[PDB]
Each structure stands twice: as C-alpha cells, then as structure tokens.
Design a protein around this ligand. Structure first.
Ligand SMILES: COCc1noc(CNC(=O)c2cc([C@@H]3NC(=O)N[C@@H](C)[C@H]3C(=O)Nc3ccc4n[nH]cc4c3)ccc2F)n1
Lengths: 336, 617, 57
C-alpha cells in the first residue's frame, strides 16, 4: 500500500536526520568549555517585591524600557508595574477570568493576554485603557503571545498550532501547524524572522515567520516542554520541561548541546531566560525556586529562593540589569 | 416590625433563583397579584408601547364585574369605540380578524355577556407575552418584583409575628384566637392546636390532613369558606392562620335566636352551597357539615370552617364512617361503602332541617342515643308547615339512595341552585354577599413528645402565595414601594458623591451580600459584598475594592451547617481550612450553594485539562 | 490514517533532512565566543556599581 511506504519512508527519513546529526557530534559543549573559568557563585538579592495580585500569577513580560512589566494573574487582571518604584501604572480587569499569558509590545503602547477564552486580546495603553482588538481563530487556549510590532503578533495555543495575526484587520494571516501536542510557549528570534515553540509532544520547532513553514524539530525531552527562550544571538535556544531538566539546542548544529539537570531536582521547569550575554540561563521551577545555570559549563551557579509557591514565570530585562519572578503566591519579585 | 425590602442588589441572586425553576415567564409573573401590579406599573407609566394594551385589558376586567346588561350595553360600546374602533381607523389594531368580529357581532345584536371580550383577553396576553415582557424583565420594575419575591420566600412566622388577642373558639385539640399580623396589620384568626393533646387522642393524622385540606381550597379567595393564609408550629403547638370570623357559629345562634323561618334559612343555605361548590370543584368532601361548623362574620354572612374531617377524593373515594351523627348520609354510615360529594348534599339537608325545627331530622324525642339516630338514616316525614318548594328541596337532598339525591345527579351544585326553593335568588348577588343576613351578631398532663414525634410536623409549615400577596397588596404594598423608592433613589443620587460597578463588563456569575465568619468567640460576622467568578470568589467592603478572595481550586466541598439555628454554608479548603458563610434569606442561601457547587466542580474539571494551570507532583 | 497527511509528513521531513549542518565543535565555539564578547555588558555576570544599578538605592 502507499500509506505503508509513507509511514516507512518517514522512518527512513527520521533515521537519515539522526545520522546527519551524529555526524556532527565531533565534540560536546562541555568538552569545548572545559578551559574557561567558572562564573563563581551568583548571589542576587530581592530589590523589589510587587504586591497587588490576589491569586496565582501565571505569566509576565518585560517592556523594552527594562522598567515596565506586565503580569497576568489568576485574579483575572493584568497589572503593569513600574518596577523602579513598585507603583501600579495600570490595572486591567479582563473580560475573561481564565487568563494564562501576557506580553508587552516593543513600543510599549499595547499589551496582550489570553487563556481559556481562546482569544488574544490587545489592550491599548494610550485617555483610557480598553480592548482595541479581540483576536479569535484558535480552537484551544492561548498559551503565549509575543508582538512582532504594533501591527503583527505571534500566538501559541492548545490546539497544537501557532499563528501570525494582523492587528488592524484582526485576521489570522498564517498558521503554523506541525505539533502533535498543546503548544505551551513561543520565543521570537532577535531578528524577528524566526521563532521557536515548545509543546506537550516533548519537541520544539523552529518556524519562519514569513514563509509560515517549520524548518527544524528538536526532540530530546521526556515530557511536556513548558518554556522556551532564544539565545541572545539567535543561533540557539533553551527549553524547560516537566522532566526536571533544561536543554540547550543549537540551530546550525541541529541538535541538543547541553542538559541542565540534577538528581537533587525532581519538579518541572515553568520558565526560562538568558542573561544579556547568554552566559547565564535562569529557570523557574515548581519547587518554588529559580535556579541560575551556567549556560556554557552546565554547573548550577545560583538559586533564587523567595517564593512560597510555584515560580510560574521569569524574565531578564533587555539591559540585563534585573530578573523578575512571578509565583503562584501572587507576588512578583525583582532580583538583581 | 414592618416589612423591610432588600436592596436592589438582590436582583442578581433572585433572578437566577427564579430562572432555575422556570418562574421567569409571562404566565407565572402576570398571574401573581404583586407581579401583575408591578408589570402593570411598568407598562402604563414607563412604556408607551404597552400602555394601551393594559388599559384595554383592565377595562375588560372592569367590564366583567358589571352587574346588569344596562351597564354592559353602556360599556361594551365605550370599550369598542375606544380600544377597537379607534384602533382600526389607525390600522394599529394588533389583533386577529376573529377577535374583532366576535365582539362586533355581539354588539350589533345587543347580546352582551360578561365574557364578551374574552377572545381579546387571550390575544392581549399574546401581545404582552413576548417583547414587552422581556423589556419588563430588563426594567427596574422586575427588580422590585425580585425584592418582593425574596421577602415572600424568606417568610418564617413565629408567635412574635402575631399579636394574639381574645379566644373565639374551643375544641378537643386546641383553641382559636383572634390576632393581628404585625407585618401588615391584617386581622386574622389563629387556630392554636396542642401537640400534647393531639397524641393523647392519637389525632396526629387529622391534624396534618386539615392543613392539606386547607391548602386545596385556600386558592381563589372563596368568600364562603374559612381559608388558610399561613401554617406554622412551635415545639408545643400547631398554628393555623385563617380568615377571621368573629360572629360565632350557627350552633350558638340557633340556641339563641331559635329556629329560623324558611326565608332566614334560605340565606344560610345559599351561601353554604357556594362554599360547598368551592370544595367540590376542588375534590373535597366536608363530611362534617352542621351548624357548629358554620361561622358568621361581623355582618352575618357565613363560611364553612374546620376541614379536619374533610378529605380529597380526586384519586380514591373515601368509605370511612366519618362525620357527626344525625348529619351523615346512609352511604357514609355504611362502612366499606365508598361515597362522593353526596354526603355533603345529604348533610346539607340534615342541617337545613335543624335550622327550621331545632333538632336534627333524625334525632327523635330529644334522644341522646347514637345507635337510634343513625338507624332512622337507613320516609322521614316533614311537617305540614313546610312549603312545597322547601318540601321538594329537602325531599331531594335526603333521598336514601344516591341515584335520586338532589345534587348527585350530574351537574353538581347547579342542581341545588335550580331548586324551586331558590327561584327568587340571583346567585351572582349571593356570591357578592348582597343579600341581607337574617342574624347580626351583637358585640391531660403526664404526656411528652420529641424527636420521633416532631418529624410528623416537619412539612407542616406553609405559606399560601396567593393569600400573602393579596394581604400585602391591600395593606403596605403601595406604602412600602414609595418608602423604598425614595430610599433607593438617595443611595444612587448620593453615590454620585462617592462614585462604576465591579460586575459589569466581565464574566461574573453572581453577586450579592453575604456574611463571612471571623473569630467565632467574638460573634464576628463581616458583612461583605461577594462576587462569584468561574474561578474565584471575591468580596469587599464599602468604598473599597475586593482585597481578598477564595479560588474554586481551594474549595473542596460545600455543605450546609446549622450555626445557632441559622442555615449557613461550610466551605472546606484544601489547606485544612474552613470557610463559613451566612445569607440574608433562604433563596440567597439555596442559590449560593448550587452556584458555588457548580463553580468549584466545573472549574476543577477544567483545570485538570490545562497543563499550565493544574497541580503537578 | 489519511493518505494526504502522510505525504505532508514525508515532505516536511525532507525539508528538515536537507539542511546544511555544522560540526558541534564549531557551533559550541561561536556560543562560547559570544559570551566572552558581551560578558562585560552583562550586569548579572559583572556586578555594576550602585550608581549604575537602578535597583540599589
Ligand atoms: C389539628 O387538628 C385539627 C382538628 N381535628 O379535629 C378537631 C376537632 N375540633 C377542634 O379541635 C376545635 C374545634 C373548635 C370549634 N368547635 C367546633 O365544633 N366547630 C368549630 C367551627 C370550631 C371553631 O371555633 N373553628 C374556627 C375556625 C376558624 C376561625 N376563625 N375565627 C373563628 C374561627 C373558628 C375550636 C378549636 C378546636 F381546636 N380539630
């Protein structure tokens, strides 16, 4: 049958892709970096504690100004914090209480959010604050969204797909099909021409925004991929998973480079981010702690212990000055 | 003391409460006394579209109450010209061809029965059942309806709610008092019946039956039966709130005035028949009809009272030998012989005879022998002084066999009205109490019970909706609406001083006032306004915003718990914590328990399917 | 199950298989080189003084 030789040819191509990757494993990232000096022990302290959320915090995102940050909470609100003074610039009551994610536009004029309502809502900040667009099209929950500019935005959903939206027309320009599980996170490449996504299928995918196609698929995790973040230079990305390990994947090499794990860590990872230089990889864990990893040597550099419930999100500012941590205990803390 | 209406914020909880029971339809709200007055108050004043529809309906109702044709002939034309002809000329007559022709046909032919505009009544409701009723719900007149419907479903009557007065009746199981309801000032009668003296005579069954019997007949406002408005009990007594009849019974007045002439006895017979027609239409045989059970009001009109021995024959016909000896039909005395309403028609003849001759038709030589009075029941020669019309009446009412008894021949009470003894009476004038009454009334121990004995009376408390609404409509309904209108308009006009609502524009499920428990040793109850969302329960004080909440995930179970004999809700939290809530009324508590249960069950089944929200190891 | 989607799976794997890869030793060097060029601009790696730290005050 032809269906047979299409399942068989897919196996023969999966083998061809595995062999082509092994042929590039002349060395490891740990062998290459055995000579550079360790980073020492990173000792950050809580600079700000953001109080104002009445329930679990689910997601946060930094503004380009490295000062303003937006957070989405179980209390059905978005709070845009002024991290320098802890004042609440804005407080947005949402039309739906099932919010899951939030994003800050590069220009700082709009914010986006969504969740089980299966809608990506754009909120104009420029004088009142009301919804300017409801982006409907997904048949599953909105897991993550990131602006390209004030006119385009990429989303990830529980319907196992991603999408690019035109904000003015509200249309679903292109869709990104390929995943076989709920897509849980997306990260845009610095040049905005590609983005990666992590799903519950335990695989990550590199997509072309313009071509709307999937270029590469990165497997290796044993469970759902909850978080994903691009390496500052756009040639690699990190992933957090329920298997209690973080993993670094290189694009030009097309495979995994490093696993950040420990027999002492059992719970899953909820968020990931890189320091401005990419040297440090921060990860939010389900054991209430955020672990700072050495991205190059894989050693555990530091720990951010200050939350009494799950750490559900984190993010490093563009200037790398501080790092934010959102928790199920309703607080956002700024470490530096 | 006085009725206090709940705040308009009650609309959120009551509307979902009524909608869950299909009580938010045009049929059910329009046919309620207070519902009609508010729906009318909405159309006539606050909606120019529905103003003529109600005035036409109301004019038809007034037309139905006209007494003579000369009054209908003069009104059927006004109603026709104003609400039929004038509309046809403007092409705005929103009715079918049948309704219009049916009325005009009877007009040009001068045949004007009181039911002339019935085909219009059916279509006036059809015109209101739709869009007008929907805008009515959206209006603030339906909010007030929810405010009134809340106080009705929160009625918990105790002895304190009544100002008890003098005694007006004694029996084997209790006394009847004249009382005044403090709520509305309505004068009632309170039949207080002793639970102790009940078990001592093993009359527990009859007690529950009378209240069941009073319920079957207390609808429709019958002017010739002593009907029930309320029923409640204490650990010791049972209380019936009945129509007040402070004129005594006929048994007493018969012994005072002596036998009544044929004309005086025709008055009581007419009004007693109409009362029987009320029961018989509702499948109730009184069985115990005698002068002692006929009460006079202050003017002399009479009602039948005490439905203890009455029973429903809608399903199965009674065969027991129940009643008072001397008034029981042959079918009744004969045990194992089912009977119908005929017993009352026979009892009527037995009673009416005694009103004329001073003794029951069978009680001979003033005998005190029970086995001889029932013997004669199974000829009964009538004196020569009885007129042929009266003689033929009792002759049909007292026939030994039911196949020939007057009133048991097919048409019911109509067969007794058509009797030539009542040929002079206009029964509409009897129903309207227009006839002059002939008589104007001038002005043990060593017994216990509990637990297993108080479960028999758990379904005893009751409230007749029609009775309570009719009581409120004719007392404080208008006065309370005016005081509540001025009181509500101040808070809003005054809130413009302070200042949007927290429930609009979101996915809020329900909101209202609740009292959450603080430190119990301090009787600390915090009255907060709660907001229930699909994933959390928020609450706040006045002026502030919700600063706390409780998530549906934290909630494990929702139970009902008694705290100081007040219905409260017990929410058990996952962290071994507990959360107690108290409501202002039962409908609020019933709704909060359902919604909270539905909210925590739907939210938890949903979270499990969201990998980012559910709990993991 | 469907024949149309099995073809689409083979075509996608073709696009993923016919790319230009580099040695992991090369990819690991570019990364290690990047971290050196910008390690001085990383306030988390190199502690900046309080006068330049917006959060210490
Ligand atoms: C819970 O069980 C109910 C029950 N079952 O059998 C019985 C037996 N009867 C009594 O016990 C009882 C009787 C009476 C008076 N005695 C009578 O021969 N006929 C009555 C009209 C009655 C009375 O006052 N009736 C009323 C009834 C309503 C009135 N409103 N205003 C004046 C009123 C008078 C008085 C008190 C009594 F307790 N009661």
């Amino acid at each position: 049958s032809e269906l047979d030789q299409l399942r068989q040819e897919a196996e023969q191509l999966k083998n061809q892709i595995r062999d082509a990757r092994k042929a590039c494993a002349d060395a490891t990232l740990s062998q290459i970096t055995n000579n550079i000096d360790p980073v020492g022990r990173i000792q950050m302290r809580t600079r700000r504690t953001l109080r104002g959320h009445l329930a679990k915090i689910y997601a946060m995102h930094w503004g380009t100004d490295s000062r303003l940050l937006v957070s989405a909470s179980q209390d059905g609100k978005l709070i845009i914090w002024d991290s320098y003074t802890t004042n609440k610039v804005h407080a947005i009551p949402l039309r739906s209480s099932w919010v899951m994610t939030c994003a800050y536009a590069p220009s700082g004029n709009y914010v986006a959010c969504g969740g089980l309502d299966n809608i990506c809502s754009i909120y104009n900040l420029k004088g009142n604050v009301r919804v300017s667009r409801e982006l409907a099209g997904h048949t599953g929950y909105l897991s993550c969204c990131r602006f390209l500019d004030d006119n385009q935005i990429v989303t990830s959903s529980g319907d196992t797909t991603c999408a690019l939206w035109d904000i003015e027309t509200g249309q679903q320009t292109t869709t990104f099909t390929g995943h076989t599980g709920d897509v849980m996170s997306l990260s845009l490449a610095p040049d905005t021409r590609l983005f990666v996504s992590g799903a519950c299928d335990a695989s990550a995918k590199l997509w072309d925004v313009r071509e709307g196609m999937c270029r590469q698929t990165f497997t290796g995790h044993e469970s759902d991929i909850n978080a994903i973040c691009f390496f500052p230079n756009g040639n690699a990305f990190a992933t957090g998973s329920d298997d209690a390990t973080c993993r670094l994947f290189d694009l030009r090499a097309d495979q995994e480079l490093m696993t950040y794990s420990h027999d002492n860590i059992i719970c899953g990872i909820t968020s990931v981010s890189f320091s401005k230089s990419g040297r440090l990889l921060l990860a939010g864990y389900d054991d209430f702690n955020c672990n700072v990893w050495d991205a190059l040597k894989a050693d555990r550099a530091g720990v951010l212990a200050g939350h009494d419930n799950r750490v559900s999100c984190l993010g490093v500012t563009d200037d790398g000055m501080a790092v934010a941590t959102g928790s199920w205990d309703s607080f956002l803390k700024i470490w530096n | 003391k006085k009725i206090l209406l709940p705040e308009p914020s009650i609309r959120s909880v009551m509307q979902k409460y009524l909608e869950d029971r299909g009580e938010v339809t045009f049929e059910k709200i329009f046919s309620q006394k207070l519902g009609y007055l508010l729906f009318r108050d909405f159309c006539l004043n606050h909606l120019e579209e529905a103003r003529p529809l109600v005035e036409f309906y109301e004019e038809i109702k007034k037309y139905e109450k006209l007494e003579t044709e000369e009054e209908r002939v003069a009104r059927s034309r006004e109603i026709f010209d104003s609400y039929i002809m004038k509309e046809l000329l403007a092409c705005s007559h929103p009715f079918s061809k049948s309704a219009t022709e049916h009325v005009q046909g009877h007009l040009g032919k001068k045949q004007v029965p009181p039911d002339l505009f019935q085909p219009y009544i059916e279509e006036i409701c059809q015109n209101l059942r739709g869009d007008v009723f929907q805008k009515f719900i959206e209006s603030d007149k339906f909010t007030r309806f929810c405010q009134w419907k809340n106080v009705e479903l929160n009625i918990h009557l105790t002895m304190n709610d009544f100002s008890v007065h003098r005694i007006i009746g004694r029996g084997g199981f209790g006394e009847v008092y004249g009382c005044r309801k403090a709520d509305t000032g309505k004068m009632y009668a309170m039949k207080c019946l002793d639970k102790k003296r009940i078990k001592m005579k093993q009359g527990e069954t009859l007690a529950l039956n009378e209240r069941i019997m009073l319920s079957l007949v207390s609808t429709g406002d019958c002017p010739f039966i002593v009907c029930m408005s309320y029923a409640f009990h204490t650990p010791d007594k049972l209380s019936f709130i009945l129509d007040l009849m402070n004129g005594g019974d006929l048994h007493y007045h018969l012994s005072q005035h002596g036998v009544f002439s044929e004309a005086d006895m025709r008055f009581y017979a007419a009004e007693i028949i109409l009362g029987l027609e009320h029961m018989h239409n509702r499948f109730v045989v009184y069985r115990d009809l005698k002068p002692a059970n006929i009460l006079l009001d202050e003017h002399g009109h009479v009602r039948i009272s005490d439905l203890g021995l009455a029973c429903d024959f809608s399903k199965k016909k009674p065969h027991a030998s129940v009643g008072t000896h001397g008034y029981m039909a042959p079918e009744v005395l004969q045990k194992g012989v089912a009977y119908d309403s005929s017993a009352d028609w026979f009892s009527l003849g037995c009673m009416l005879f005694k009103l004329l001759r001073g003794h029951s038709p069978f009680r001979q030589h003033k005998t005190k022998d029970k086995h001889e009075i029932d013997r004669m029941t199974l000829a009964v020669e009538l004196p020569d002084s009885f007129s042929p019309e009266l003689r033929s009446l009792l002759e049909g009412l007292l026939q030994r066999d039911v196949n020939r008894r007057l009133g048991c021949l097919g048409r019911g009470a109509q067969e007794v009205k058509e009797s030539p003894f009542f040929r002079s009476l206009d029964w509409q004038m009897v129903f309207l109490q227009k006839y002059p009454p002939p008589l104007i009334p001038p002005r043990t121990k060593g017994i216990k019970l509990l637990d297993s004995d108080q479960e028999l009376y758990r379904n005893f408390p009751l409230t007749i909706s029609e009775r309570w609404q009719q009581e409120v409509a004719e007392t404080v309904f208008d006065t309370i609406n005016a005081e509540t209108d001025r009181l509500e308009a101040r808070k809003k006009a005054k809130n413009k001083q302070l200042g949007e609502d927290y429930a609009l524009g979101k996915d809020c499920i329900m909101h209202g006032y609740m009292s959450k428990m603080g430190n119990p040793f301090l009787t600390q109850w915090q009255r907060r306004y709660f907001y229930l969302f699909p994933n959390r329960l928020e609450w706040r004080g006045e002026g502030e915003a919700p600063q706390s909440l409780l998530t549906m995930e934290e909630i494990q179970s929702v139970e009902e718990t008694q705290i100081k004999e007040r219905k409260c809700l017990l929410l058990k939290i996952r962290g071994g914590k507990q959360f107690i809530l108290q409501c202002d009324s039962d409908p609020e508590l019933v709704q909060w328990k359902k919604e909270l249960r539905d909210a925590y069950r739907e939210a938890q089944q949903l979270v499990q399917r969201v990998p980012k929200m559910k709990n993991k190891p | 199950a469907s024949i149309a989607q099995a073809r689409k799976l083979v075509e996608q794997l073709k696009m993923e298989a016919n790319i230009d890869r580099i040695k992991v030793s090369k990819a690991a060097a570019d990364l290690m080189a990047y971290c050196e060029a910008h390690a001085k601009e990383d306030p988390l790696l190199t502690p900046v003084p309080a006068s330049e730290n917006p959060f210490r005050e």
